[PDB]
């Protein structure tokens, strides 16, 4: 991701875009959607025991937010 | 479903590097179409795999799916290609607190008390959601547009319905006694770390700092905190109520928020 720094990414253009975004937050579900459950096997192209064996860490009683 | 979205590198334009972090670099970026500004953190899979910390990445993402708070850095989503995992993060326009400490050495009372209030608020929310953070320290803290603190990284954190774990976590200077002893601990490890953080922010070094590992362990276990002549009484009081050997004696988050020194000095701002 090594590119020449474009004008939007510095100085007043960046500040003003940040200001706009700060005071006009978008609908983040619509923008980014659901956070998909992690498949460690898929991501690392390996089967390891820790990938499948969970503790209570895996048991959520509160809702996904987005 | 309808909100299962396709995210790839081609959805983003890169602005500039923001710095090296664990397992890769962070970049300022924006979504090509909406122009929504983010930080894109690029994680190298091989580095994570080698170190065997795949389960920590899973913890981050699962925590991020269930928690949001104005003082927690938000993970909007993630994706991956063959070699890299990309975290699409909330952009923190005022950057690393630990860079703003290189500037001054220590923070003033207003700035510190503000961060302490924000963190006690954030951790109340975490603890209510059965998440122990376990890595509260300056290097984990980013600054929002108006300086509001953002906890950056949940990699050492865990969701624990029972609020009882045993993994040794975090950095040397921030270890609570019960972790050094290898005992089972609860969420009150976070209370200890707030104490340590408050000290370091005001003083510019952590309270049990020593040239050697064993000596640090010894100072932690003895709770050998000695406050420099520079520190105001209110802060010495707050820190003394948090840095207790016994977890059950540590000042609860609700009472940190009510602490006269926090109330006096905090100048917290919230985004919309
Ligand atoms: C393998 O398991 C995991 C588990 C968790 C993660 N999550 C993760 O890496 N999150 C994250 C997010 C922001 C970070 C860091 C880490 C990080 O890598 N930090 C280091 C230095 C200590 O662990 C914490 C810093 C606050 C780091 C600062 N970076 C380098 C510059 C930065 C500048 C501005 C930013 C920004 C990041 O994100 C939003 O806006 O910003 C990754 C892999």
mmCIF file of C-alpha atoms and ligand atoms in Angstrom:
data_model
loop_
_atom_site.group_PDB
_atom_site.id
_atom_site.type_symbol
_atom_site.label_atom_id
_atom_site.label_comp_id
_atom_site.label_asym_id
_atom_site.label_seq_id
_atom_site.Cartn_x
_atom_site.Cartn_y
_atom_site.Cartn_z
ATOM 1 C CA UNK A 1 0.000 0.000 0.000
ATOM 2 C CA UNK A 2 2.944 2.430 -0.728
ATOM 3 C CA UNK A 3 1.601 5.262 -2.953
ATOM 4 C CA UNK A 4 2.371 9.009 -3.350
ATOM 5 C CA UNK A 5 0.258 10.839 -0.714
ATOM 6 C CA UNK A 6 -2.865 12.237 -2.507
ATOM 7 C CA UNK A 7 -4.307 15.676 -1.713
ATOM 8 C CA UNK A 8 -7.365 14.282 0.125
ATOM 9 C CA UNK A 9 -5.049 12.594 2.666
ATOM 10 C CA UNK A 10 -3.404 15.720 4.186
ATOM 11 C CA UNK A 11 -3.830 19.334 5.296
ATOM 12 C CA UNK A 12 -7.137 21.182 5.096
ATOM 13 C CA UNK A 13 -8.833 18.653 2.734
ATOM 14 C CA UNK A 14 -8.286 15.840 5.296
ATOM 15 C CA UNK A 15 -9.286 17.996 8.296
ATOM 16 C CA UNK A 16 -12.489 19.170 6.609
ATOM 17 C CA UNK A 17 -13.433 15.596 5.500
ATOM 18 C CA UNK A 18 -12.735 14.388 9.090
ATOM 19 C CA UNK A 19 -14.920 17.201 10.450
ATOM 20 C CA UNK A 20 -17.751 16.301 8.086
ATOM 21 C CA UNK A 21 -17.541 12.576 8.971
ATOM 22 C CA UNK A 22 -17.306 13.327 12.718
ATOM 23 C CA UNK A 23 -20.607 15.340 12.739
ATOM 24 C CA UNK A 24 -22.357 13.298 9.981
ATOM 25 C CA UNK A 25 -21.696 9.644 10.947
ATOM 26 C CA UNK A 26 -23.189 7.289 8.295
ATOM 27 C CA UNK A 27 -25.251 4.136 8.811
ATOM 28 C CA UNK A 28 -22.341 1.713 9.471
ATOM 29 C CA UNK A 29 -24.408 -1.487 8.935
ATOM 30 C CA UNK A 30 -25.398 -0.227 5.492
ATOM 31 C CA UNK A 31 -21.808 0.784 4.727
ATOM 32 C CA UNK A 32 -19.865 -2.236 6.058
ATOM 33 C CA UNK A 33 -22.464 -4.944 6.778
ATOM 34 C CA UNK A 34 -22.245 -7.834 9.228
ATOM 35 C CA UNK A 35 -18.929 -8.914 10.718
ATOM 36 C CA UNK A 36 -18.660 -12.497 9.387
ATOM 37 C CA UNK A 37 -17.616 -15.226 11.884
ATOM 38 C CA UNK A 38 -13.917 -16.024 11.623
ATOM 39 C CA UNK A 39 -12.909 -19.285 9.929
ATOM 40 C CA UNK A 40 -9.288 -19.688 11.103
ATOM 41 C CA UNK A 41 -8.871 -22.800 8.865
ATOM 42 C CA UNK A 42 -9.912 -20.781 5.843
ATOM 43 C CA UNK A 43 -7.767 -17.758 6.786
ATOM 44 C CA UNK A 44 -4.541 -19.642 7.611
ATOM 45 C CA UNK A 45 -5.025 -22.686 5.277
ATOM 46 C CA UNK A 46 -4.137 -25.050 8.105
ATOM 47 C CA UNK A 47 -5.953 -27.187 10.644
ATOM 48 C CA UNK A 48 -4.802 -26.677 14.213
ATOM 49 C CA UNK A 49 -6.560 -27.841 17.420
ATOM 50 C CA UNK A 50 -6.937 -24.265 18.826
ATOM 51 C CA UNK A 51 -8.877 -23.365 15.648
ATOM 52 C CA UNK A 52 -11.683 -25.766 16.714
ATOM 53 C CA UNK A 53 -11.333 -25.996 20.509
ATOM 54 C CA UNK A 54 -13.023 -23.037 22.274
ATOM 55 C CA UNK A 55 -13.440 -22.099 25.943
ATOM 56 C CA UNK A 56 -16.374 -20.145 27.368
ATOM 57 C CA UNK A 57 -14.819 -17.338 25.291
ATOM 58 C CA UNK A 58 -17.026 -18.535 22.401
ATOM 59 C CA UNK A 59 -20.353 -18.347 24.298
ATOM 60 C CA UNK A 60 -21.892 -14.872 23.819
ATOM 61 C CA UNK A 61 -25.123 -14.038 25.677
ATOM 62 C CA UNK A 62 -25.337 -10.416 24.335
ATOM 63 C CA UNK A 63 -26.289 -9.537 20.715
ATOM 64 C CA UNK A 64 -23.997 -8.792 17.757
ATOM 65 C CA UNK A 65 -24.226 -5.017 17.308
ATOM 66 C CA UNK A 66 -23.839 -4.570 13.483
ATOM 67 C CA UNK B 1 -28.036 -12.350 4.220
ATOM 68 C CA UNK B 2 -28.770 -8.833 2.909
ATOM 69 C CA UNK B 3 -25.931 -7.371 5.057
ATOM 70 C CA UNK B 4 -23.276 -9.946 4.060
ATOM 71 C CA UNK B 5 -20.947 -7.663 2.113
ATOM 72 C CA UNK B 6 -17.967 -8.136 -0.140
ATOM 73 C CA UNK B 7 -14.910 -6.152 1.000
ATOM 74 C CA UNK B 8 -11.572 -6.179 -0.836
ATOM 75 C CA UNK B 9 -8.526 -3.917 -1.277
ATOM 76 C CA UNK B 10 -10.130 -2.437 -4.451
ATOM 77 C CA UNK B 11 -12.866 -0.847 -2.267
ATOM 78 C CA UNK B 12 -10.189 1.408 -0.697
ATOM 79 C CA UNK B 13 -7.821 4.195 -1.753
ATOM 80 C CA UNK B 14 -4.656 4.448 0.392
ATOM 81 C CA UNK B 15 -3.833 7.901 1.799
ATOM 82 C CA UNK B 16 -0.589 7.492 3.757
ATOM 83 C CA UNK B 17 1.198 5.247 6.303
ATOM 84 C CA UNK B 18 0.234 5.813 9.975
ATOM 85 C CA UNK B 19 3.012 3.612 11.474
ATOM 86 C CA UNK B 20 4.194 0.085 12.237
ATOM 87 C CA UNK B 21 2.056 -1.917 14.668
ATOM 88 C CA UNK B 22 2.065 -5.541 15.793
ATOM 89 C CA UNK B 23 2.158 -7.934 12.769
ATOM 90 C CA UNK B 24 2.062 -5.070 10.165
ATOM 91 C CA UNK B 25 1.534 -1.448 9.147
ATOM 92 C CA UNK B 26 -1.443 0.884 9.547
ATOM 93 C CA UNK B 27 -2.553 3.216 6.740
ATOM 94 C CA UNK B 28 -4.931 6.118 6.411
ATOM 95 C CA UNK B 29 -7.431 5.134 3.710
ATOM 96 C CA UNK B 30 -10.908 5.894 2.439
ATOM 97 C CA UNK B 31 -13.654 3.952 0.743
ATOM 98 C CA UNK B 32 -13.431 4.766 -3.017
ATOM 99 C CA UNK B 33 -17.199 5.286 -3.427
ATOM 100 C CA UNK B 34 -18.492 6.757 -0.121
ATOM 101 C CA UNK B 35 -15.116 8.457 0.732
ATOM 102 C CA UNK B 36 -15.598 7.290 4.341
ATOM 103 C CA UNK B 37 -12.208 7.622 6.012
ATOM 104 C CA UNK B 38 -10.701 4.676 7.901
ATOM 105 C CA UNK B 39 -7.419 3.253 9.146
ATOM 106 C CA UNK B 40 -6.582 0.055 7.288
ATOM 107 C CA UNK B 41 -4.317 -2.221 9.299
ATOM 108 C CA UNK B 42 -2.524 -4.817 7.216
ATOM 109 C CA UNK B 43 -1.686 -7.980 9.198
ATOM 110 C CA UNK B 44 0.750 -10.543 7.755
ATOM 111 C CA UNK B 45 -0.757 -14.006 8.284
ATOM 112 C CA UNK B 46 2.644 -15.760 8.360
ATOM 113 C CA UNK B 47 3.777 -13.573 11.325
ATOM 114 C CA UNK B 48 0.595 -14.382 13.299
ATOM 115 C CA UNK B 49 0.720 -18.075 12.359
ATOM 116 C CA UNK B 50 4.399 -18.406 13.337
ATOM 117 C CA UNK B 51 3.740 -16.914 16.770
ATOM 118 C CA UNK B 52 0.620 -19.140 17.165
ATOM 119 C CA UNK B 53 -1.678 -16.200 18.074
ATOM 120 C CA UNK B 54 -4.527 -17.016 15.627
ATOM 121 C CA UNK B 55 -6.888 -17.335 18.613
ATOM 122 C CA UNK B 56 -6.138 -13.699 19.684
ATOM 123 C CA UNK B 57 -7.192 -12.413 16.237
ATOM 124 C CA UNK B 58 -10.433 -14.366 16.662
ATOM 125 C CA UNK B 59 -10.961 -12.821 20.105
ATOM 126 C CA UNK B 60 -10.486 -9.261 18.688
ATOM 127 C CA UNK B 61 -13.005 -9.805 15.927
ATOM 128 C CA UNK B 62 -15.591 -11.532 18.158
ATOM 129 C CA UNK B 63 -15.276 -8.776 20.789
ATOM 130 C CA UNK B 64 -15.560 -6.114 18.080
ATOM 131 C CA UNK B 65 -18.742 -7.734 16.729
ATOM 132 C CA UNK B 66 -20.429 -7.438 20.197
ATOM 133 C CA UNK B 67 -18.997 -4.159 21.704
ATOM 134 C CA UNK B 68 -19.058 -0.546 20.602
ATOM 135 C CA UNK B 69 -18.199 2.487 22.733
ATOM 136 C CA UNK B 70 -17.023 6.033 21.887
ATOM 137 C CA UNK B 71 -13.720 5.318 23.705
ATOM 138 C CA UNK B 72 -13.139 1.908 22.081
ATOM 139 C CA UNK B 73 -11.491 1.997 18.624
ATOM 140 C CA UNK B 74 -14.147 0.460 16.364
ATOM 141 C CA UNK B 75 -13.428 -2.372 13.962
ATOM 142 C CA UNK B 76 -15.907 -1.704 11.167
ATOM 143 C CA UNK B 77 -15.076 -5.026 9.500
ATOM 144 C CA UNK B 78 -12.213 -7.186 8.253
ATOM 145 C CA UNK B 79 -11.315 -9.192 5.144
ATOM 146 C CA UNK B 80 -8.333 -11.153 3.906
ATOM 147 C CA UNK B 81 -6.372 -12.128 0.806
ATOM 148 C CA UNK B 82 -3.830 -14.943 0.403
ATOM 149 C CA UNK B 83 -1.098 -13.402 2.621
ATOM 150 C CA UNK B 84 -2.808 -10.644 4.687
ATOM 151 C CA UNK B 85 -5.710 -9.923 7.006
ATOM 152 C CA UNK B 86 -7.026 -6.365 6.789
ATOM 153 C CA UNK B 87 -8.637 -4.631 9.752
ATOM 154 C CA UNK B 88 -10.920 -1.785 8.693
ATOM 155 C CA UNK B 89 -10.649 0.483 11.718
ATOM 156 C CA UNK B 90 -11.982 3.759 13.001
ATOM 157 C CA UNK B 91 -9.435 6.472 12.096
ATOM 158 C CA UNK B 92 -7.971 8.299 15.137
ATOM 159 C CA UNK B 93 -7.047 11.748 13.755
ATOM 160 C CA UNK B 94 -4.888 12.862 16.734
ATOM 161 C CA UNK B 95 -2.917 9.549 16.597
ATOM 162 C CA UNK B 96 -0.961 7.661 19.283
ATOM 163 C CA UNK B 97 -1.103 8.933 22.861
ATOM 164 C CA UNK B 98 2.435 7.450 23.245
ATOM 165 C CA UNK B 99 3.679 9.925 20.579
ATOM 166 C CA UNK B 100 2.099 12.831 22.532
ATOM 167 C CA UNK B 101 3.998 11.564 25.638
ATOM 168 C CA UNK B 102 7.318 11.699 23.705
ATOM 169 C CA UNK B 103 6.451 15.413 23.333
ATOM 170 C CA UNK B 104 5.824 16.388 26.969
ATOM 171 C CA UNK B 105 7.199 13.481 29.114
ATOM 172 C CA UNK B 106 4.031 13.489 31.229
ATOM 173 C CA UNK B 107 0.443 14.680 30.765
ATOM 174 C CA UNK B 108 -1.199 17.403 32.860
ATOM 175 C CA UNK B 109 -3.936 16.625 35.341
ATOM 176 C CA UNK B 110 -6.760 17.645 32.949
ATOM 177 C CA UNK B 111 -5.618 15.361 30.140
ATOM 178 C CA UNK B 112 -4.947 12.446 32.519
ATOM 179 C CA UNK B 113 -8.220 12.757 34.456
ATOM 180 C CA UNK B 114 -10.084 12.944 31.121
ATOM 181 C CA UNK B 115 -8.474 9.697 29.907
ATOM 182 C CA UNK B 116 -9.115 8.046 33.267
ATOM 183 C CA UNK B 117 -12.834 8.973 33.142
ATOM 184 C CA UNK B 118 -13.104 7.739 29.517
ATOM 185 C CA UNK B 119 -11.357 4.451 30.306
ATOM 186 C CA UNK B 120 -13.456 3.781 33.436
ATOM 187 C CA UNK B 121 -16.557 4.385 31.288
ATOM 188 C CA UNK B 122 -15.227 2.146 28.456
ATOM 189 C CA UNK B 123 -14.220 -0.639 30.903
ATOM 190 C CA UNK B 124 -17.605 -0.471 32.719
ATOM 191 C CA UNK B 125 -19.133 -1.215 29.298
ATOM 192 C CA UNK B 126 -16.525 -4.008 28.640
ATOM 193 C CA UNK B 127 -17.047 -5.613 32.042
ATOM 194 C CA UNK B 128 -20.850 -5.503 31.648
ATOM 195 C CA UNK B 129 -20.331 -7.404 28.322
ATOM 196 C CA UNK B 130 -18.034 -9.901 30.166
ATOM 197 C CA UNK B 131 -14.853 -8.713 28.470
ATOM 198 C CA UNK B 132 -11.634 -8.228 30.471
ATOM 199 C CA UNK B 133 -9.248 -5.992 28.538
ATOM 200 C CA UNK B 134 -5.930 -7.016 30.278
ATOM 201 C CA UNK B 135 -3.695 -4.648 28.269
ATOM 202 C CA UNK B 136 -4.549 -1.116 29.341
ATOM 203 C CA UNK B 137 -1.297 0.877 28.841
ATOM 204 C CA UNK B 138 -0.320 4.093 26.964
ATOM 205 C CA UNK B 139 0.888 2.307 23.803
ATOM 206 C CA UNK B 140 -2.685 0.935 23.345
ATOM 207 C CA UNK B 141 -4.316 4.388 23.383
ATOM 208 C CA UNK B 142 -5.228 6.519 20.376
ATOM 209 C CA UNK B 143 -6.737 10.021 20.276
ATOM 210 C CA UNK B 144 -9.895 10.994 18.430
ATOM 211 C CA UNK B 145 -10.665 14.163 16.551
ATOM 212 C CA UNK B 146 -11.132 16.277 19.737
ATOM 213 C CA UNK B 147 -8.635 14.196 21.776
ATOM 214 C CA UNK B 148 -11.153 11.603 23.120
ATOM 215 C CA UNK B 149 -9.242 8.447 23.995
ATOM 216 C CA UNK B 150 -9.693 5.209 22.010
ATOM 217 C CA UNK B 151 -8.596 1.794 23.296
ATOM 218 C CA UNK B 152 -6.883 0.410 20.148
ATOM 219 C CA UNK B 153 -6.391 -3.366 20.372
ATOM 220 C CA UNK B 154 -8.261 -6.300 22.037
ATOM 221 C CA UNK B 155 -5.610 -8.949 21.116
ATOM 222 C CA UNK B 156 -4.763 -9.640 24.797
ATOM 223 C CA UNK B 157 -8.431 -9.304 25.811
ATOM 224 C CA UNK B 158 -10.995 -12.062 26.309
ATOM 225 C CA UNK B 159 -14.692 -12.554 26.549
ATOM 226 C CA UNK B 160 -15.299 -14.607 29.715
ATOM 227 C CA UNK B 161 -18.910 -15.170 30.859
ATOM 228 C CA UNK B 162 -17.609 -16.293 34.274
ATOM 229 C CA UNK B 163 -15.126 -13.321 34.549
ATOM 230 C CA UNK B 164 -12.375 -15.765 35.643
ATOM 231 C CA UNK B 165 -9.251 -16.508 33.598
ATOM 232 C CA UNK B 166 -5.613 -17.481 34.143
ATOM 233 C CA UNK B 167 -3.665 -16.563 30.968
ATOM 234 C CA UNK B 168 -0.638 -14.371 31.706
ATOM 235 C CA UNK B 169 -1.254 -11.194 29.660
ATOM 236 C CA UNK B 170 -0.029 -7.700 28.944
ATOM 237 C CA UNK B 171 3.332 -6.071 29.460
ATOM 238 C CA UNK B 172 5.755 -6.482 32.413
ATOM 239 C CA UNK B 173 5.224 -3.041 34.038
ATOM 240 C CA UNK B 174 1.401 -3.478 34.062
ATOM 241 C CA UNK B 175 1.179 -7.070 35.430
ATOM 242 C CA UNK B 176 -1.105 -7.346 38.500
ATOM 243 C CA UNK B 177 0.172 -9.453 41.434
ATOM 244 C CA UNK B 178 -2.259 -12.333 40.807
ATOM 245 C CA UNK B 179 -0.876 -12.790 37.258
ATOM 246 C CA UNK B 180 2.752 -12.923 38.506
ATOM 247 C CA UNK B 181 1.661 -15.573 41.034
ATOM 248 C CA UNK B 182 -0.035 -17.491 38.225
ATOM 249 C CA UNK B 183 -3.375 -17.507 40.024
ATOM 250 C CA UNK B 184 -6.934 -17.315 38.632
ATOM 251 C CA UNK B 185 -8.046 -13.690 38.332
ATOM 252 C CA UNK B 186 -11.146 -11.672 37.486
ATOM 253 C CA UNK B 187 -12.000 -8.345 35.785
ATOM 254 C CA UNK B 188 -10.312 -6.416 38.650
ATOM 255 C CA UNK B 189 -6.974 -6.886 36.840
ATOM 256 C CA UNK B 190 -8.253 -3.940 34.715
ATOM 257 C CA UNK B 191 -8.666 -1.785 37.875
ATOM 258 C CA UNK B 192 -4.978 -2.423 38.735
ATOM 259 C CA UNK B 193 -3.905 -1.394 35.202
ATOM 260 C CA UNK B 194 -5.918 1.865 35.349
ATOM 261 C CA UNK B 195 -3.904 2.673 38.518
ATOM 262 C CA UNK B 196 -0.626 1.935 36.819
ATOM 263 C CA UNK B 197 -1.693 3.955 33.752
ATOM 264 C CA UNK B 198 -2.736 6.984 35.846
ATOM 265 C CA UNK B 199 0.698 6.960 37.510
ATOM 266 C CA UNK B 200 2.622 6.638 34.214
ATOM 267 C CA UNK B 201 0.616 9.413 32.498
ATOM 268 C CA UNK B 202 1.258 11.888 35.372
ATOM 269 C CA UNK B 203 4.869 10.811 36.166
ATOM 270 C CA UNK B 204 6.161 9.716 32.731
ATOM 271 C CA UNK B 205 7.275 6.263 33.888
ATOM 272 C CA UNK B 206 5.363 3.349 35.463
ATOM 273 C CA UNK B 207 5.436 2.888 39.248
ATOM 274 C CA UNK B 208 7.330 -0.467 39.435
ATOM 275 C CA UNK B 209 9.929 0.304 36.693
ATOM 276 C CA UNK B 210 13.305 -1.389 37.327
ATOM 277 C CA UNK B 211 16.394 -2.275 35.263
ATOM 278 C CA UNK B 212 15.572 -5.955 35.877
ATOM 279 C CA UNK B 213 12.608 -8.274 35.330
ATOM 280 C CA UNK B 214 12.795 -9.915 38.811
ATOM 281 C CA UNK B 215 13.012 -6.553 40.611
ATOM 282 C CA UNK B 216 9.893 -5.361 38.731
ATOM 283 C CA UNK B 217 8.090 -8.531 39.831
ATOM 284 C CA UNK B 218 9.302 -7.854 43.413
ATOM 285 C CA UNK B 219 8.115 -4.189 43.354
ATOM 286 C CA UNK B 220 4.710 -5.214 41.846
ATOM 287 C CA UNK B 221 4.098 -7.982 44.400
ATOM 288 C CA UNK B 222 5.049 -5.683 47.326
ATOM 289 C CA UNK B 223 2.970 -2.862 45.746
ATOM 290 C CA UNK B 224 6.065 -0.663 46.173
ATOM 291 C CA UNK B 225 4.508 2.565 44.855
ATOM 292 C CA UNK B 226 6.320 5.768 45.780
ATOM 293 C CA UNK B 227 4.836 8.974 44.433
ATOM 294 C CA UNK B 228 7.221 11.717 43.178
ATOM 295 C CA UNK B 229 7.134 15.134 44.816
ATOM 296 C CA UNK B 230 5.397 16.461 41.607
ATOM 297 C CA UNK B 231 2.101 14.508 42.048
ATOM 298 C CA UNK B 232 -1.063 16.175 43.431
ATOM 299 C CA UNK B 233 -2.781 14.535 46.411
ATOM 300 C CA UNK B 234 -6.014 13.704 44.532
ATOM 301 C CA UNK B 235 -4.107 11.597 41.980
ATOM 302 C CA UNK B 236 -1.958 9.933 44.703
ATOM 303 C CA UNK B 237 -5.228 9.029 46.471
ATOM 304 C CA UNK B 238 -6.905 7.608 43.354
ATOM 305 C CA UNK B 239 -3.834 5.561 42.358
ATOM 306 C CA UNK B 240 -3.421 4.280 45.969
ATOM 307 C CA UNK B 241 -7.054 3.050 45.924
ATOM 308 C CA UNK B 242 -6.492 1.138 42.645
ATOM 309 C CA UNK B 243 -3.043 -0.376 43.331
ATOM 310 C CA UNK B 244 -4.103 -2.820 46.045
ATOM 311 C CA UNK B 245 -2.609 -6.295 46.358
ATOM 312 C CA UNK B 246 -6.088 -7.673 47.081
ATOM 313 C CA UNK B 247 -8.297 -7.434 43.932
ATOM 314 C CA UNK B 248 -11.508 -7.069 46.009
ATOM 315 C CA UNK B 249 -10.050 -3.925 47.669
ATOM 316 C CA UNK B 250 -9.468 -2.109 44.365
ATOM 317 C CA UNK B 251 -11.618 0.996 43.772
ATOM 318 C CA UNK B 252 -14.522 -0.022 41.475
ATOM 319 C CA UNK B 253 -14.981 1.673 38.080
ATOM 320 C CA UNK B 254 -18.197 3.358 39.299
ATOM 321 C CA UNK B 255 -16.196 4.984 42.088
ATOM 322 C CA UNK B 256 -13.303 5.950 39.798
ATOM 323 C CA UNK B 257 -15.881 7.942 37.811
ATOM 324 C CA UNK B 258 -17.085 9.620 41.074
ATOM 325 C CA UNK B 259 -13.546 10.241 42.455
ATOM 326 C CA UNK B 260 -13.161 13.938 43.393
ATOM 327 C CA UNK B 261 -9.871 14.312 41.478
ATOM 328 C CA UNK B 262 -11.458 12.761 38.328
ATOM 329 C CA UNK B 263 -14.549 14.983 38.740
ATOM 330 C CA UNK B 264 -12.416 18.111 39.348
ATOM 331 C CA UNK B 265 -10.043 17.735 36.426
ATOM 332 C CA UNK B 266 -11.790 15.729 33.666
ATOM 333 C CA UNK B 267 -12.787 17.766 30.550
ATOM 334 C CA UNK B 268 -14.223 14.897 28.562
ATOM 335 C CA UNK B 269 -15.929 15.494 25.212
ATOM 336 C CA UNK B 270 -18.189 12.988 23.405
ATOM 337 C CA UNK B 271 -18.734 12.704 19.606
ATOM 338 C CA UNK B 272 -22.327 13.043 18.255
HETATM 339 C C1 LIG C 1 -2.981 -11.903 15.947
HETATM 340 O O1 LIG C 1 -4.016 -11.338 16.747
HETATM 341 C C2 LIG C 1 -4.346 -10.024 16.542
HETATM 342 C C3 LIG C 1 -5.166 -9.510 17.531
HETATM 343 C C4 LIG C 1 -5.586 -8.195 17.478
HETATM 344 C C5 LIG C 1 -5.227 -7.393 16.418
HETATM 345 N N1 LIG C 1 -5.641 -6.057 16.400
HETATM 346 C C6 LIG C 1 -4.808 -5.015 16.142
HETATM 347 O O2 LIG C 1 -3.671 -5.153 15.712
HETATM 348 N N2 LIG C 1 -5.360 -3.795 16.437
HETATM 349 C C7 LIG C 1 -4.646 -2.583 16.470
HETATM 350 C C8 LIG C 1 -5.250 -1.382 16.095
HETATM 351 C C9 LIG C 1 -4.542 -0.214 16.141
HETATM 352 C C10 LIG C 1 -3.212 -0.211 16.535
HETATM 353 C C11 LIG C 1 -2.570 -1.418 16.914
HETATM 354 C C12 LIG C 1 -3.310 -2.597 16.885
HETATM 355 C C13 LIG C 1 -1.136 -1.682 17.321
HETATM 356 O O3 LIG C 1 -0.456 -2.448 16.632
HETATM 357 N N3 LIG C 1 -0.643 -1.061 18.408
HETATM 358 C C14 LIG C 1 0.718 -1.348 18.904
HETATM 359 C C15 LIG C 1 1.724 -0.300 18.578
HETATM 360 C C16 LIG C 1 0.799 -1.957 20.225
HETATM 361 O O4 LIG C 1 0.171 -3.224 20.220
HETATM 362 C C17 LIG C 1 -1.433 -0.046 19.119
HETATM 363 C C18 LIG C 1 -1.212 1.325 18.526
HETATM 364 C C19 LIG C 1 -2.204 2.349 19.087
HETATM 365 C C20 LIG C 1 -1.235 1.292 16.972
HETATM 366 C C21 LIG C 1 -0.837 2.618 16.380
HETATM 367 N N4 LIG C 1 -0.633 2.584 14.928
HETATM 368 C C22 LIG C 1 0.630 1.941 14.573
HETATM 369 C C23 LIG C 1 -0.793 3.908 14.342
HETATM 370 C C24 LIG C 1 -2.230 4.318 14.173
HETATM 371 C C25 LIG C 1 -2.506 5.658 13.927
HETATM 372 C C26 LIG C 1 -3.806 6.117 13.731
HETATM 373 C C27 LIG C 1 -4.797 5.199 13.761
HETATM 374 C C28 LIG C 1 -4.539 3.869 13.993
HETATM 375 C C29 LIG C 1 -3.272 3.392 14.178
HETATM 376 O O5 LIG C 1 -5.712 3.157 13.977
HETATM 377 C C30 LIG C 1 -6.741 4.143 13.921
HETATM 378 O O6 LIG C 1 -6.144 5.387 13.578
HETATM 379 O O7 LIG C 1 -2.604 1.023 16.539
HETATM 380 C C31 LIG C 1 -4.400 -7.907 15.416
HETATM 381 C C32 LIG C 1 -3.956 -9.212 15.484
#
